[PDB]
Amino acid sequence: VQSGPRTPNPYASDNSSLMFPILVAFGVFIPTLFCLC
Amino acid sequence: PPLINEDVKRTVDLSSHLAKVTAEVVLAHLGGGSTSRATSFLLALEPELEARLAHLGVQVKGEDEEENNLEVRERFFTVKLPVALDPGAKISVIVETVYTHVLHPYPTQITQSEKQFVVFEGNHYFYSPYPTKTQTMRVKLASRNVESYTKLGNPTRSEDLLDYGPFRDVPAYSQDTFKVHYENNSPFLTITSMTRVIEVSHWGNIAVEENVDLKHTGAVLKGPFSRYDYQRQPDSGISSIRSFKTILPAAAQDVYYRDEIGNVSTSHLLILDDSVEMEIRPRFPLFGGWKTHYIVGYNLPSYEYLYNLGDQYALKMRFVDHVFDEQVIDSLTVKIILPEGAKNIEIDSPYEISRAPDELHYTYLDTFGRPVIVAYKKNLVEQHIQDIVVHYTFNKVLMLQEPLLVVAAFYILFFTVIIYVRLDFSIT
Amino acid sequence: AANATAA
Amino acid sequence: IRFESIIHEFDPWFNYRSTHHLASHGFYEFLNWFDERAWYPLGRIVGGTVYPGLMITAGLIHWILNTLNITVHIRDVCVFLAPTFSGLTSIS
Amino acid sequence: ELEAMSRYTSPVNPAVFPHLTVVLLAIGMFFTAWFFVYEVTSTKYTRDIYKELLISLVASLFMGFGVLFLLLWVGIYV
Amino acid sequence: VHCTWVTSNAYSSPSVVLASYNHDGTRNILDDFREAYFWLRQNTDEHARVMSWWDYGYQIAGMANRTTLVDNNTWNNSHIALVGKAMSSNETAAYKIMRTLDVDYVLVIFGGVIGYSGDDINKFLWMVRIAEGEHPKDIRESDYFTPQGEFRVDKAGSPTLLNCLMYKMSYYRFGEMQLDFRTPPGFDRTRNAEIGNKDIKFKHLEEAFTSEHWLVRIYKVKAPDNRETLDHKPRVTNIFPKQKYLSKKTTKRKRGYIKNKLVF
Ligand SMILES: *[C@@H]1O[C@H](CO)[C@@H](O[C@@H]2O[C@H](CO)[C@@H](O[C@@H]3O[C@H](CO[C@H]4O[C@H](CO[C@H]5O[C@H](CO)[C@@H](O)[C@H](O)[C@@H]5O)[C@@H](O)[C@H](O[C@H]5O[C@H](CO)[C@@H](O)[C@H](O)[C@@H]5O)[C@@H]4O)[C@@H](O)[C@H](O[C@H]4O[C@H](CO)[C@@H](O)[C@H](O)[C@@H]4O[C@H]4O[C@H](CO)[C@@H](O)[C@H](O)[C@@H]4O)[C@@H]3O)[C@H](O)[C@H]2NC(C)=O)[C@H](O)[C@H]1NC(C)=O
Ligand SMILES: CCCCCCCCCCCCCC(=O)O[C@H](COC(=O)CCCCCCCCCC)COP(=O)(O)OCC[N+](C)(C)C
Ligand SMILES: CCCCCCCCCCCCCC(=O)O[C@H](COC(=O)CCCCCCCCCC)COP(=O)(O)OCC[N+](C)(C)C
Ligand SMILES: CCCCCCCCCCCCCC(=O)O[C@H](COC(=O)CCCCCCCCCC)COP(=O)(O)OCC[N+](C)(C)C
Ligand SMILES: *[C@@H]1O[C@H](CO)[C@@H](O[C@@H]2O[C@H](CO)[C@@H](O)[C@H](O)[C@H]2NC(C)=O)[C@H](O)[C@H]1NC(C)=O
Ligand SMILES: *[C@@H]1O[C@H](CO)[C@@H](O[C@@H]2O[C@H](CO)[C@@H](O)[C@H](O)[C@H]2NC(C)=O)[C@H](O)[C@H]1NC(C)=O
Ligand SMILES: [Mg+2]
C-alpha cells in the first residue's frame, strides 16, 4: 500500500548545467544584434 | 487426479464492513494407481455469494502466489500447482477470499443515540468438490454482543470469537446455513463511483486526480439530527464516520482536496519517510444514506514512474490507489491521457479490466487530439492495488510543436500591424 | 454595501 | 491570493448561474429560459426579466477562449471578468 | 523489460524554468519595443519591409518561447 | 499608498467564508455556509422546496441547487409578505402558510454561538414590517416589543415573540449550550442577554441539520397529524373512587395485571 523511499533527482549538476541554457540564449541574442549590417 | 483434503481450518473475519474468510486446506492424493498427474485442483463457490466475490487469492507456505483461472463446469476456479504431487504426498494451500456487501444491517432504521446491528449469512462447511476429513470454523466478530448464532455443533464463545466443532466427515458440494447477528460500530463507507484521470507530460510532471462519490450504506438514520446531542453527549452516533485517512504516494507535491462548490479546508497532510498520509475530514459527518463527492489531486515528477529507451517509453503506475482502510469500490474508470504524438500504445494489466475504445482529449495549445485510454472495472477491493504498465512510442521533435504555435500566434499579431500601416482608405 | 437586509 | 477563487456576494450568484446556463445551452435557450426552480409556485421568466449584458459577455469570452483549445472553466471567467474590464475602463 | 530502460528526465532541468523565462522574456520585450518604435517614427516611403519582417520574426520567436516557459513555470505543463 | 491600504484592509473580504483570527496570527475559517448548502445539495430530494428570507434566495439556488420560494431579486412583494408572516407567527398559522405553499425545509441563519452580526434575529423586525405592510389585521409590530417599548430577548421580552416561529426556530436547544468559558448556560454572544425561554419543543417541525458553529440551521416540515386526539383527559366523575393502579413492572418482571382474571 505504501510505496517506499523517494528517488533523488538525476537532473543536473551545478556550475555547468544550470547556466548552460541561459548562456545559449545570450549567445544567440548577441549575433542577432549583429544583422544590422 | 482424485484427491481429498485432510484437514481444513477456515477463519471468517467480520470485524470489517466486508467478510474475509481464509481456509488452510491440505490436499492429499489417494494412492490409487501410478497416475502421478495431479496438476490442477478445482475450487468452488457457493451460489448465494457468487455475485459478491471481490478478490480470490491462493498462497502456499507463505511463498509466491499461484495463478487461478476462472472455469465453467457443465462458478469455479482452477489452480495450477507449481510442482505436481505424486500419490501419497500432502500440500498445504491457503485460500483467502474477500466478500463485499454481505453484512446487512438488520434494524435498518437507527436513531442518532443507538447502536448498529448487522446480520451475516454464511456457510458452516468448506464448500469444496472434495470430501473433508476434519474441518474447524472460527468466527471473529467485532464486539462482545451476539444476539442469535446458529449452533450446528453447540460452539463455544470466548472474548468476541466463537469457535465451532470438528465436523468430522462430510460429502462433496455440501451446504448448510449459518447466521450470526452482532453489534458492529464500524465505518460502513462505500465508494459508489470513482473516476481516476492520469495525465502524462514529458516536460517533467504527471498529474493524477480522482473524483470519489461515497455513501454510508448501513443503518440509515431516522428522526431528527441534533448537533447538541452529537457534540455534548458522549457515545452518540458511534456508527457515524467523521474522518478517514488516505495514503498518498511518496513525492506527491501539489495535493489539492476540493469539492464541487469550492475548496475544503479540513484536511491534515503529514509527509512521512515512505509515503504522504493525508487525513480527509468531510464537510459534514456521515450518518447512513448520506453521501459526499470530493476531488483529490496531486502531481508527481516523472523521473520515478516513466522509463524510456531511445524512442520507446513505458509508464508504470497503480491501477487504483489507497483511499481509506478496507475500501470498497463499486464502479471505477481509469483514464490515461498520453501526450499528443503517441504512435503505438500497449497496456499490460495484471487482472481482467474492461477497456473501451479510445477518445481524444483537447487541451492547451494542441492541434491533434492526444490519445486517452479508458478502462472500466467493477467491485474493486483493498487488494486490487496493483501496477499496470503502458508502452508507447513518441518522436522527440514533435515536442517542439508546442513552442511553435505561440510563436506563430505572436507573428500573426505582428503581421496585422505590418498590414495595417499599408492601408490608406481615404477618399480625397 | 450588498443586497442584504440592513442589520 | 487569500481564501479561494470563488464568488462572494449575494447578487453575483444569480449572474453566475444564468451564465452557466448560457454556456451549457446556447443563446436561444437562455433567451427563452423559464426557470421553475425559483419563486416556486410562480416561476421566473429569466430571459425576459434580466439584463443580458454581463451573461452574454462572459459567455462570448468563454466560447472564444475554448475554441482556441484554452480550456478554462466558466467560473474562472466569471471570477476574473471584472479586472480585465477595469483595464478597459482606464483606457476609456 | 522495465529493467533495461532508464528513468525519464525532462529535457530542461525544472529548477531553471524561472531563470530561463525572464531571460527569454526580457529580450523578447526589448525586441518588440524596437519594432514598435520603428513603426512610429517612419514615413511610408522610408519604411523597409524586410527589416519589419525580420524584427517581427525574431521578437515573435523569443516572445513565444518565453511565453511557453512562463506557462510551464506556473504549473500548466503543456 | 492610501488606495493600496484601503483595498487591502476594507473591500477585500468575502461573505461566503468567514475568517476568525487567532491571537498568534493564525487564521481559522468558519466555513458553515458552504457546509450547510452542500448538505442541502446532496442529502435532499431533487425537488425539495426550501423557505428562506429573500437575502439568501440566490445563494441557495446557486450553491445548494434547490427550489427556493422567495429570491433575492424582488418583483412580487406579497409573496415576500407571506414568507414574512410565516417567519413571524406561532407554529399553527405558520404551519398553515407552509402547507399551502408545499414547502419542505426551512433555513435560518443563526449567528449566536459565534459573534456574527447579521443573523435572522437582527433582520427579524424588517420581516415584521414587511408582513405588516400587506396584512395589517394579523401582524402588529408593537406586539413584538416589551411594554417599556424596546426589543429584547430576555425574560422581559414579550410573550408574543417568545412563541414566534423565528424565535422558536433559531434558539432550539440553545438553553443548554454553555461555552467552556465561565458564562451563563444560555447566552447570546450578539444580543448579550440570557435567553428567557430555555426549553422549546416543536409540534410540526423537526431538526434536520445544524452546522458546526450553529451558524445555519435547517428544519424539516413534518407530515400532517396521523390522527386527531382528544384535547382533554377522558371523563372522570367523583361518584366511584378512581383508585389508579401502580406500574409494577421492571426490566425483569414484564407481567401485566387483569382485574377479571381467574386465579389459580
Ligand atoms: C484550501 O484547501 C487546502 C486543503 O484542504 C487547505 O490546506 C490545509 O491547511 C491546513 C491548515 O490550514 C494544513 O494543515 C496542517 O497540517 C499539519 C500536519 O498535521 C498533522 O501532523 C501534526 C504533527 O504530527 C506529528 O506530531 C504529533 C505530536 O504532536 C504526533 O502525534 C504525530 O504522529 C506526528 O509525529 C499533528 O499535530 C496533526 O494532528 C492534528 O489534527 C488531529 C486531527 O485528528 C488532531 O486530533 C490533533 O490533536 C492535531 O490537532 C496532524 O496529524 C499541521 O502540522 C499544521 O499545523 C500547523 O498549523 C497549526 C495552526 O492551524 C499550528 O498550530 C501548528 O503548530 C502548525 O504550525 C505550523 O506552521 C507554522 C507556520 O504557520 C510553523 O511555524 C510551525 O512550526 C508548524 O510547521 C496544519 O494543521 C493542511 O496541510 C492543508 N492541506 C494541504 C493538502 O496542504 C487550505 O488552507 C485551503 N485554503 C483556503 C481555504 O483558503
Ligand atoms: C453592418 C455593416 C454596414 C456596412 C457598411 C456599408 C457601407 C456602404 C458604403 C460605405 C462607403 C465607404 C466610405 C469610406 O470608406 O471612407 C471612409 C469613411 O467612411 C465612413 O465613415 C463610413 C464607414 C462605414 C463602414 C464601416 C464598417 C464596414 C465594415 C467593412 C470593413 C474614409 O473617409 P475619410 O474622410 O477620407 O477618412 C480618412 C481620415 N484619415 C485620417 C484616416 C485618413
Ligand atoms: C480573448 C479575451 C481574453 C480576455 C482574458 C480573459 C481572462 C480569463 C482568464 C482566467 C484565468 C483563471 C486562472 C485561475 O483560475 O487562477 C486561480 C487564481 O489564482 C491566481 O492568483 C491567478 C491570478 C493571475 C491570473 C492572470 C491571468 C489573466 C491574464 C489575462 C489578462 C488559481 O487559484 P486557486 O488555486 O484555484 O485557489 C487556491 C488559492 N490558495 C492560495 C488557497 C491556494
Ligand atoms: C490567445 C488569446 C489570448 C490568451 C489569453 C490567456 C488566457 C489565460 C488562460 C487561463 C488558463 C487557465 C489556467 C488553469 O487552468 O488553472 C490552473 C493553472 O493556472 C494558474 O494557476 C494561473 C496561471 C495563469 C497564467 C497565464 C499566463 C499566460 C499569458 C500568455 C499571454 C490549473 O487548474 P488545476 O491545477 O487543474 O486546478 C483547478 C483550480 N481552479 C480553481 C483554477 C479550477
Ligand atoms: C441541479 O439539480 C438538478 C436536479 O437534480 C440537475 O438537473 C438534472 O441534470 C441532469 C444532468 O444535467 C439530468 O440528467 C437530469 O434529468 C436533470 N434533472 C431535471 C429535473 O431536470 C442540475 O443539473 C443540477 N445543476 C448542476 C449540477 O449544476
Ligand atoms: C397562534 O396565532 C393565531 C393568530 O396569529 C391564533 O389564532 C387566533 O386565536 C384567537 C384566540 O382565541 C382566536 O380568537 C382567533 O379566532 C384565532 N384566529 C385569528 C385569525 O385570530 C392562535 O390561537 C395562536 N395559537 C396559540 C397561541 O397557541
Ligand atoms: Mg508534450
- Three-class HEC string of F174-225: CCCCCCCCCCCCCCECCCCECCCCCCCCCCCEEEEEECCCCCEEEEEECCCC
Of F16, F177, F208, the CB nearest to B225: F208
Burial of B62 (0-12, 13-18, 19+ CB in 10 A): exposed
- Interatomic CA distance for residues B333 and F6, integer angstroms: 49
With touching defined as 3+ CB pairs under 8 A, do chains F and A touch?
no
What is the bridge-based pairing of β-strands F49-51 and F18-21? unpaired
Residues on chain E touching A12 (C-beta within 8 angstroms): 13, 15-16
Place of cell 454561538: F113
Q: Specify which residues F105 forms β-bridges with.
A: F50, F220
Say if ligand 3 is within 6 A of residue D6 CB.
no
Smallest-distance ligand from the CA of D1: 3
Amino acid at B34: S
> Ligand 2: which atom is nearest the Cα of residue B427?
36
Best CA proximity match to F81, nearest among F27, F8, F130: F130
Instruction: Name the residue facing F14 among D8, D37, D42 (closest C-beta).
Output: D8
Would you state the cell numbers that stand for residue F163, as one nine-digit string?
412563541
Residues 1-7, chain C, touching F (beta carbon < 8 A) = 2-7
Contact D11 C4 (CB under 8 A): no
How many separate domains does chain E show?
1
Across the interface, do D71 and B262 touch by the CB < 8 Å criterion? no
Instruction: Indicate the residue type of B28.
Output: A
- Cβ distance B307 to E7 less than 8 Å, yes or no, reads yes
* Torsion E5-E6-E11-E15 (CA) sign: positive
Distance from C-alpha of A34 to C-alpha of B171, rounded to nearest angstrom: 96
CA dihedral for B398, B399, B404, B405, sign (positive or negative): positive
Strands F49-51 and F67-68: parallel
Q: Decide: D61 in ligand 3 pocket, CB within 6 A.
A: yes
Strands, DSSP E only, in F82-147?
A: 105-109
Residues of B in contact with E77 (CB under 8 A): 201, 203-205, 207, 299
Q: How far is CA B143 from the centre of its chain?
A: 26
Decide: residue F86, CB within 10 A, 0-12 exposed, 13-18 middle, 19+ buried: buried
Residue B320 CA to ligand 4 center (angstroms) comes to 29
Which ligand has an atom closest to residue B252 CA? 1
Nearest alpha-carbon partner for F20 in F116, F97, F104, F106: F116
Which 8-state DSSP code applies to residue F253? -
Residues of E in contact with A11 (CB under 8 A): 9-10, 13-15
Domain range holding E49?
1-78
- Residue positions forming the annotated binding site of D for Mn(2+): 11
Could you tell me which of B174, B194, B417, B418 has the C-alpha nearest to residue B321? B194
Smallest CA separation from ligand 1 atom 67, residue: F26
- CA-CA-CA-CA torsion sign (D42, D48, D54, D55): positive
Give the method of determination: cryo-EM
In a mutational test of the C interface, the residue from D7, D8, D9, D13 whose CB has the highest number of chain C CBs within 10 Å is: D9
For the Cβ of B314 lying below 6 angstroms from any atom of ligand 1, the answer is no
A24 contact E CB<8A = no
**Which residue has 520574426 as its cell numbers?**
E57
